[PDB]
DNA sequence: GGTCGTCTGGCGTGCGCGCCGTTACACCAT
RNA sequence: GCGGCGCGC
DNA sequence: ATGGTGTAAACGCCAGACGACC
């Protein structure tokens, strides 16, 4: 019943408790991050695409898949590409931009990234809504979600585990928020842990 | 670069700061670093010297010497001066000073050119010269012996010595201005001000009053835990200096934390429902901070005791009870018996600017903590911040807000607050102001001020003011100083019915908005099921209009309650109003919610504080302004006008005696207030023993016919289109935007009979009105997109047909009747090209527009593309529209000027000009002088000339150089007409 | 001065020189549809989609792929893929929901069409503008454009080339072009004609 | 390297002040 | 700065 | 009294860029 609402796709429980890496998708209007597990809550990669050619007044899509594809070309190999869904709709009269050129990015992704669909037909790419993430970690106020900064400094700084290969470089990003914060890097990983504890280690 | 500019607006704030003692740890630490030597000696040693020579020291500037040697830069004779500074406050046993003078003889440095060079304190140049005359007393040197004086041709009567002139003193004892100035002062020391709000109160209760207790201990919470925090985050960032760089503290340590903690517990306050944008939150903290540091700066400088003795040294040429040894104007009296210095403050660049405002609101949000929930329950009784970060979208791009706690807001919503509060330049002055002296010195007593508008940047018109001599610019500031020193009231009777309509559910049709309590409700509900469905779609069309209506209410009654309390404060008190000018020379006052330049009301309820007794020919212009307010008829002569008001004097007395009981005859005129203000002040006088005996306060209004035409009529002279303004004499006053509609509707008179749609549903609906705004462009640049986008919103408010095509109209008269347009102005056409042709091709060559007003002022245009390309097209159709507007300030200044000389209290509105009901011939007089005074000059060769001295001197290509040489050298040929029957025209400013 | 506003992308005009086959897809609300051709102006395919669960509610990228990759399954192998470009302004505050469904469809059709495109980066799916082929046949009122069932209508029912073998069975689909204003969409052959008439 | 004639697109008469809100609205059955 | 409004010459 | 929460698809024109020019 609540998977109903937390997953879109409908996906049989078996194949969910053997689940081995996923790959959590944040998209933004400037920027894309992602971040990478491997079932042991063990971090190994997680990046950031600044410096695009996109929304700048023209839409072709001759752009947007060079652009794509030069960022799926770094993206290793995973069970699953869980991807982060949010409550924008049609109605609003402005705002449609933003809308447009979201719906672009999850369509061409979800287009790549998912090979083998055209001979067997199982999904490997699927959604998980935003509000049901915050109020997992309590970070629900006033009908919106807050930062979540502070959660993640506190990690990096039992839930998940941190290797010592990358833990410079986070805490170089953290500082860079700092000066400027950026959510699509923070949602990455609450996404990525609110997805191994509610669907999967029941 | 961006590092250089922080290292030098960090120097040049804590030199003013007094914190140079503390700074004094960042230059020696960073010019001991090695790679960051760079961008070092370039302008900040000189700033260093500069605030050492502030103050006294005991051989501290030795190190600065050392380091500029070290350097090996160029002292450039700035050290020197603030080492003569320093020498003083300290024993001297005159040890080689021969070599330090032959030091200064030597390296090609010379002396009497130091001193206005270095541009030190007075303080310090006179420790100087005492330095140098103690040992060699034969040099020194006055400043200037006589005052410079206009030479000008147009300004030559004004500032002649000869003559016998008479100047207007004010009605007040010189103790009563004393007082008001200390009270102004001390209003101006606190950067804000409490008002009471309008809004009336009722059923306090006991959940009331347990808010407003929870409030205050909450807010004494807050104090003592920012005040904590402020501690703790100073002395953490004292710690990181000596393994550091970079201190940003010292510009925190110069503002107490009671200033801080006042100013975050006020911002919190005025921080909306919804989130803010977190860099504007910063900003606006910076901003803050700058300027509560230039007041108390300006405050513990001792500045103020020296200003107060200035004050009231000069307030004896306004005092009613005080006496001169010669009369002079404002001016030159405050030149005279000395003069303060202008700060000439420079502000920091974004870097440091922008990085604290940013510390601050980290600051604030972190160690602000409230008792969790605030429901009635009590059980949790936990600590959460009372905000919050939130992304979000707003506009078309993802922004970070800062948004509150749900319970802050509920609690906040729960208490009536019938208090508002104001930044204190939006309020009057309650003194009378400085006069302008100079583009730096300015109208208020503390906050600086700028001369010429700018929306944003725009340093070229700055630049060109301070680069013409200063003899030029004194016509234009004795008229700001002018205008600056005129004296207002309140009336009380209009302000107290406003108020008993504004408590009682308003009155739309006066002005005056409504509450939302009586906004407008739907007819049907919504139901569920699909009964029909067209019901559905209705439905949300119908229900997705009362949002905008109730919304558009609730800014109407916002900013009516901001006045009406702005007005309600000033009552039993009397104020004063300063001006500044665009970049084409207009004028406009500074207080934005309350001035002349409003609506009815903000002009209903202001009075002259002086009065004037009526004289023999008082009452009659009285009774003139009084029709004239009404509107009624605009084309009738003045002895019609004063006629018609005999006939309504039962209706004035009704007005007058019971307004919203009787007869509400005041209703239904253009502007009903001011003239119920007129009716009770005509009654007044009339109901008096000697009616010539009366002292009156009201205004009385002259304005122009059409003053952009006017100025064409005689740059080149018509003698067809002179008659059509007035310029020429007449009987009864001729109307250019009434002949227009006749000949514009002759035809759907005479042509419905072919058949058209837009033809008959019209009827009648053409006037005046809804062509004037576009007749008036015809002879500026206009297009017809303008034109119909003009005229459908004046066919909006009429309220016969939604069917709102106006292209019928834009045509019929830029078009159709454009060649009867010619036909009926023409000739003032051939300038209209001229001057486009020739600004098209000082554009097609890569420049901006600029010349010079008759009377001296300088005039550019910033239109750029997006250093930067000209714009051809914006400064190509800007031009004409700008070069009327500066010679019609140019009009109004000097009919100002000359109207001073004779005791008059002049206030002017653009075009229309305001003064006392006795005091109406003269200024007419003054005016039709003036104007032909204006107008004889050639102004077209002049012009012509200088435009091809600007442009025309260089021979880069033989080509577009001859090109733009025979265009700017051809010049219309004027025609003949003579401009010596001004001084007898009725209606020119009538 | 033409070819810079016929295709959106920027090819070599040496490989338009050198072609062998094209295949033309047009799509809308309801159905798609699409025709092959072989250098000689001689048709092989002309096919169309019956119905979609698509645009009728949400938006939902699952179905789309769905029906792209069930659709996409039966096409035939060629050189060159064109498709249709509508110009409709953003600025407009209706025709949303078609602008969207166009943009979500043309991304998917990129994606999915243009296979080998991560080891060799040369482009094989074009943007054409439709006002061009709509001046080319000069249909156009200067404002919108006709119906084009006036050309294959004469064309079919010498330079034709049609084969033999698919005389009957494209005359058995034609004859049903009476419901549904299916024959809007046979433009793609049009379009087709325009690119070997332009590209040679 | 320098043109570059022409052909397609983006503003449209000039200047100066104030207020508001970032779709919630509506339904819900406890 | 974007959008909706309102006022003055 | 309260959160929960769902279901809502209107047109000219002139001046800088672009394929052809040299
Ligand atoms: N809409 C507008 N567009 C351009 N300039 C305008 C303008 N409104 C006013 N101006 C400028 O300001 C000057 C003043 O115009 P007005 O003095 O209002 C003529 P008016 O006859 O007094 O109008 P009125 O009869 O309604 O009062 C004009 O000559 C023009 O220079
Ligand atoms: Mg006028």
């Known amino acids: ?81 869980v991807l982060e869904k949010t409550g924008l709709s049609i109605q609003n009269s402005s705002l449609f931009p933003i809308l447009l050129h979201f719906h672009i990015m999850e369509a061409m992704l979800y287009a790549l ?90 | 670069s961006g590092q250089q500019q922080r290292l030098l607006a960090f120097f040049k704030c804590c030199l003013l700061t007094d914190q140079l003692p503390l700074a004094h740890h960042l230059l020696v630490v960073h010019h001991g670093q090695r790679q960051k030597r760079k961008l070092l000696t ?46 003083g406050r300290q024993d001297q046993d005159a040890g080689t000073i021969e070599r330090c003078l032959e030091q200064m003889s030597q390296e090609g440095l010379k002396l009497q050119a130091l001193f206005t060079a270095v541009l030190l304190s007075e303080e310090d140049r006179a420790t100087v010269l005492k330095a140098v005359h103690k040992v060699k007393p034969t040099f020194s040197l006055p400043p200037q012996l006589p005052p410079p004086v206009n030479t000008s041709k147009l300004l030559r009567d004004v500032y002649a010595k000869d003559g016998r002139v008479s100047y207007p003193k004010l009605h007040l004892p010189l103790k ?16 804000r001000v409490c008002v009471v709000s309008v809004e009336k109160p009722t059923l306090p209760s006991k959940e009331v009053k347990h808010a407003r207790k929870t409030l205050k201990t909450l807010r004494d919470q807050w104090e003592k835990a920012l005040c904590r925090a402020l501690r703790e985050t100073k002395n953490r960032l004292e710690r990181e200096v000596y393994e550091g760089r970079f201190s940003l503290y010292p510009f925190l340590c110069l503002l107490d934390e009671r200033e801080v903690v006042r100013m975050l517990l006020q911002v919190l306050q005025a921080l909306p429902a919804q989130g803010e944008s977190f860099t504007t939150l910063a900003r606006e903290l910076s901003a803050r901070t700058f300027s509560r540091h230039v007041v108390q700066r300006q405050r513990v400088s001792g500045q103020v005791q020296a200003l107060q003795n200035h004050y009231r040294k000069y307030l004896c040429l306004l005092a009613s009870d005080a006496e001169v040894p010669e009369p002079c104007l404002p001016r030159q009296y405050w030149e005279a018996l000395g003069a303060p210095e202008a700060l000439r403050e420079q502000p920091w660049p974004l870097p440091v600017q922008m990085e604290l405002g940013k510390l601050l609101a980290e600051m604030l949000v972190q160690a602000t903590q409230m008792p969790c929930s605030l429901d009635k329950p009590h059980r949790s009784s936990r600590l959460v911040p009372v905000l919050y970060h939130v992304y979000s979208f707003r506009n078309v791009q993802q922004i970070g807000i800062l948004k509150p706690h749900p319970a802050y807001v509920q609690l906040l919503e729960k208490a009536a607050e019938p208090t508002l509060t104001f930044e204190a330049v939006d309020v009057p002055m309650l003194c009378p102001p400085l006069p302008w002296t100079s583009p730096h010195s300015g109208a208020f007593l503390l906050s600086p001020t700028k001369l010429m508008r700018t929306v944003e940047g725009a340093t070229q018109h700055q630049e060109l003011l301070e680069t013409c001599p200063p003899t030029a610019l004194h016509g234009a500031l004795d008229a700001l100083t002018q205008l600056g020193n005129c004296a207002w009231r309140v009336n009380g009777r209009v302000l107290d019915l406003v108020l008993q309509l504004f408590q009682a559910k308003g009155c739309p049709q006066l002005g005056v908005p409504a509450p939302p309590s009586e906004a407008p409700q739907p007819p049907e509900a919504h139901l569920p099921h699909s009964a029909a469905p067209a019901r559905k779609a209705e439905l949300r069309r119908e229900l997705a209009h009362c949002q905008k209506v109730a919304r558009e209410m609730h800014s109407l009654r916002a900013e009516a309650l901001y006045r009406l309390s702005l007005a309600q404060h000033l009552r039993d008190r009397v104020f004063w109003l300063p001006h500044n000018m665009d970049f084409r020379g207009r004028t406009y006052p500074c207080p934005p919610h309350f001035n002349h330049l ?35 008829k605009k084309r009738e002569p003045l002895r019609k006008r004063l006629a018609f008001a005999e006939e309504v ?6 007005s007058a005696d019971q307004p919203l009981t009787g007869r509400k005859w005041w209703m239904g005129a253009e502007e009903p207030w001011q003239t119920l203000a007129c009716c009770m002040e005509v009654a007044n006088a009339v109901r008096a023993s000697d009616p010539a005996a009366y002292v009156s306060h009201l205004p009385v209004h002259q304005d122009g016919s059409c003053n952009g035409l006017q100025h064409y009529a005689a740059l080149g002279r018509d003698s067809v289109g002179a008659a059509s303004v007035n310029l020429e004499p007449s009987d009864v006053p001729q109307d250019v935007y009434s002949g227009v509609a006749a000949q514009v509707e002759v035809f759907r008179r005479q042509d419905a ?21 576009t007749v008036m462009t015809v002879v500026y640049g206009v297009t017809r997109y303008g034109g119909r986008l003009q005229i459908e919103k004046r066919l909006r408010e009429l309220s016969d047909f939604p069917q709102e095509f106006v292209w019928e109209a834009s045509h019929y008269l830029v078009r159709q009747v454009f060649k009867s347009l010619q036909e009926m102005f023409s000739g003032t056409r051939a300038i209209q090209h001229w001057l486009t042709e020739s600004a098209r091709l000082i554009s097609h060559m890569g420049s901006v527009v600029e010349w010079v007003t008759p009377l001296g002022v300088p005039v550019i245009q910033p239109y750029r593309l997006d ?92 080509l577009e150089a001859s090109q733009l040489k025979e265009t700017l050298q051809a010049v219309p040929k004027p025609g003949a007409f003579d401009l010596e029957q001004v001084k007898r025209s009725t209606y020119f400013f009538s």
Not at chain 1, 181 to 188: A, I, K, M, T
Not at chain 2, 610 to 617: D, E, I, T
Not at chain 2, 759 to 771: D, N, S
Request: hydrophobic share 40%; with cysteine.
């Open chain 2, 649 to 654: 004097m039962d209706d004035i007395l009704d």
């Open chain 2, 867 to 958: 250093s930067r390309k000209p714009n051809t097209r914006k400064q190509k159709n800007g031009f004409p529209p700008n070069f009327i507007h500066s010679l019609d300030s140019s009009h109004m200044m000097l009919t100002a000027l000359h109207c001073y000389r004779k005791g008059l209290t002049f206030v002017s509105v653009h075009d229309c000009y305001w003064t006392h009901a006795a005091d109406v011939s003269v200024m007419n007089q003054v005016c039709r002088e003036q104007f032909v005074r204006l107008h004889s000059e050639p102004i077209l060769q002049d012009l012509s000339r200088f435009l091809v001295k600007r442009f025309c001197s260089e021979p880069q290509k033989i």
């Open chain 2, 753 to 773: 009979q072919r058949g058209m749609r837009v033809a008959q549903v019209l009827e009648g609906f053409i006037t005046r009105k809804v062509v004037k705004q």
């Open chain 2, 598 to 632: 409003g609506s009815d009301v903000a002009r209903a309820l202001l009075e002259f504080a002086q009065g004037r007794p009526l004289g023999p020919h008082g009452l009659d212009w009285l009774k003139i302004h009084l029709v004239n307010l009404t509107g009624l």
């Open chain 1, 113 to 202: 990234l998912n090979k083998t669909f055209a001979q067997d037909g199982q999904h490997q790419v699927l959604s998980m809504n935003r509000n049901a993430v915050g109020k997992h970690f309590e970070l629900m106020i006033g009908d919106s979600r807050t930062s979540g900064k502070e959660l993640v400094k506190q990690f990096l700084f039992p839930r998940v585990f941190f290797p010592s290969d990358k833990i410079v470089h986070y805490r170089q990003m953290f500082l860079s928020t700092e000066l400027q914060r950026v959510e699509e890097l923070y949602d990455s990983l609450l996404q990525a842990i609110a997805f191994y504890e509610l669907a999967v280690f029941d």
């Open chain 2, 42 to 87: 370039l302008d900040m040693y000189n700033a260093v010297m500069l605030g050492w020579a502030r103050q006294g020291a005991f051989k501290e500037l030795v190190y600065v010497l050392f380091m500029v040697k070290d350097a090996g830069l160029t002292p450039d004779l700035l050290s020197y001066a603030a080492a003569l500074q320093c020498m």
């Open chain 1, 1 to 81: 019943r609540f998977l109903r609402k937390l997953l879109k796709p409908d996906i049989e429980r078996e194949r969910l408790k053997a689940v081995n890496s996923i790959i959590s998708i944040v998209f933004g209007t400037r920027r894309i991050a992602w971040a990478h597990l491997d079932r042991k809550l063990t971090v190994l990669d997680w990046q950031q695409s600044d410096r695009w050619s996109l929304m700048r007044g023209i839409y072709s899509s001759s752009v947007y898949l060079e652009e794509i594809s030069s960022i799926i070309s770094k993206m290793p190999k995973a069970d699953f590409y």
């Open chain 2, 176 to 191: 009563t201005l004393q007082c008001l100035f200390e009270k102004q002062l001390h209003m101006e020391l606190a950067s």
